[PDB]
Amino acid sequence: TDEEELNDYKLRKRKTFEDNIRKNRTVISNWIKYAQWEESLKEIQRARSIYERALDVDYRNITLWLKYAEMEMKNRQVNHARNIWDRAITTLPRVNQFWYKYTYMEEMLGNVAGARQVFERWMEWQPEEQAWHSYINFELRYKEVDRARTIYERFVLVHPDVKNWIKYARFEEKHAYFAHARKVYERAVEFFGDEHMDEHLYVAFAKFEENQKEFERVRVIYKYALDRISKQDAQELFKNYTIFEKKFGDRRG
Amino acid sequence: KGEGDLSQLSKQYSSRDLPSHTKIKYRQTTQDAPEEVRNRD
């Protein structure tokens, strides 16, 4: 009667969980514990059914989606996990975790233009900084001169952060990009803060042009100085500007 | 194609559902009937 007691255990827990969901159809603890209880049976086509009718009652929670997808991804059913990630991200665009875990899943698989397509869809909704420079970090960790150039001019139109203006000045500090890196500095210098500078762009521009030679480095800190902020700088850096310009040149007597 | 109980599925002819006030008064001309509203100041 081992079959009898086994099916008794299964039928009593199923009857318990079905009465628990039938009482409260809104708290979703019941569906996730019942569905992962059948996931503990390790061979199922019904825990899929439990989740896929558990989102009829509430599709707007992230927990059910990411738990059903990490269930389907925890097992070898990769096609189904991808096939529910795409409906998760088209149904709920603004939640970051679905995009992150679906990109991460395809990173652990091949780096196919599927993954880049997932990413550019994720770009298309105009997210925050956290996602965008994560995608440029993806393009750097596959060593893309071409594609990290491609996807990062569309960046700056939406985030004009000074922290991001100085890091569109990155082809200098990785490729040195001479003439068009100087054009990146032109793009840095003409935009917002024309007389007010946001007090930070030309610090890093002076750091690179001081890392460069005396090509045209005298101008921007001292002789393009019409654009001051009431003193041209705080007290914290102008003597540092002077000894910044002093001892890194031809040093003529 | 098989509606709820009010349509065909029930013979429960309840009272309070009995053809009371089965014609509608329209607002006639001496009151504020909408033809006399289409121009008033």
């Binding site: - | 194609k1 098989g2 065909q8 599925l9």
Partner: protein, 286 residues
């Protein structure tokens, strides 16, 4: 719960008259599976025949592409599990009263409201057919389906009606061999009937018959047709297309793949629209 306009009705249930008169109710009986109130229809097939009303609803017929009263396939005239095993997919449906039963019938009705033209899931695999089922699709059907069932009081010899007893007489049924999927009693005998046909005897040797006298080429079979139908089997050792008799000679290296060709072509390999001609070759240096 359900109205209708005209029933499904495979051809053996209509009867031999092109002019039949048929009556309808609005909510008739219930479906004998799901207890749903369809619209029962009744008619007379033939002048020696019972009335054979209507057994299941239009929904439970559109699920499995089944006729309306005798519960056979609308495309073939075959039982249900013959079709589903012959198409190797079952299109599941529950067994209990509610447990997913009227739930799934209600919802599959709700997603069948648009078409009303084809079955709900069988449409994709009812195309890749006509190979294993077409050998048993009994056309020119027997109308013993429509004859009225056997009366009592002839069974007890009491029937005072005499001749005008409408039902039948002198057909004592036998209590040894008489639902919707499985299991059904004559279907096991019919699948034993298809598994145990009449072939040619398998001659006592060790697979030497890799050659075979297949012919009736006419103008239908060409050389690349038959050797690409055998290239999926495997490799030849010698082909010829002998057109004095319209025949083709193929062999296999280590017979086995051409073995299933012997299973494929006992007057059975039907490509290009012809019952091909097959008898046994030599494999005897003759």
């Amino acid at each position: 719960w359900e109205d209708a306009d005209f029933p499904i009705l495979c051809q053996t249930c209509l009867g031999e008259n092109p002019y039949i008169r048929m009556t309808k109710e609005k909510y008739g009986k219930e479906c004998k599976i799901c207890a749903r109130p369809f619209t029962v229809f009744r008619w007379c097939p033939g002048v020696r025949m019972r009335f054979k009303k209507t057994e299941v609803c239009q929904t439970c017929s559109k699920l499995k592409n089944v006729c309306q009263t005798c519960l056979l396939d609308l495309e073939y005239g075959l039982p249900i599990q013959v079709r589903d095993a012959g198409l190797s997919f079952k299109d599941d449906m529950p067994k209990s009263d509610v447990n997913k039963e009227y739930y799934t019938q209600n919802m599959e009705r709700e997603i069948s409201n648009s078409d009303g033209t084809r079955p709900v899931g069988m449409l994709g695999k009812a195309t890749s057919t006509s190979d294993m089922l077409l050998k048993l699709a009994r056309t020119t059907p027997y109308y013993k389906r429509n004859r009225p069932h056997i009366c009592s009081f002839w069974v007890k010899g009491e029937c005072k009606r005499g001749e005008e007893c409408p039902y039948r007489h002198e057909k004592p049924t036998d209590p040894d061999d008489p639902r919707y999927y499985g299991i059904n009693d004559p279907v096991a005998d019919k699948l034993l009937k298809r598994a145990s046909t009449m072939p040619r005897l398998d001659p006592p040797e060790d697979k030497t018959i890799t050659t075979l006298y297949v012919g009736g080429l006419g103008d239908t079979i060409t050389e690349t047709d038959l050797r690409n139908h055998f290239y999926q089997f495997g490799e030849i050792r010698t082909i010829t297309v002998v057109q004095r008799q319209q025949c083709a000679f193929i062999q296999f290296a280590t017979r086995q793949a051409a073995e299933v060709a012997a299973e494929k072509s006992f007057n059975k390999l039907i490509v290009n629209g012809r019952r091909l001609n097959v008898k046994w070759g030599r494999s005897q240096a003759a």
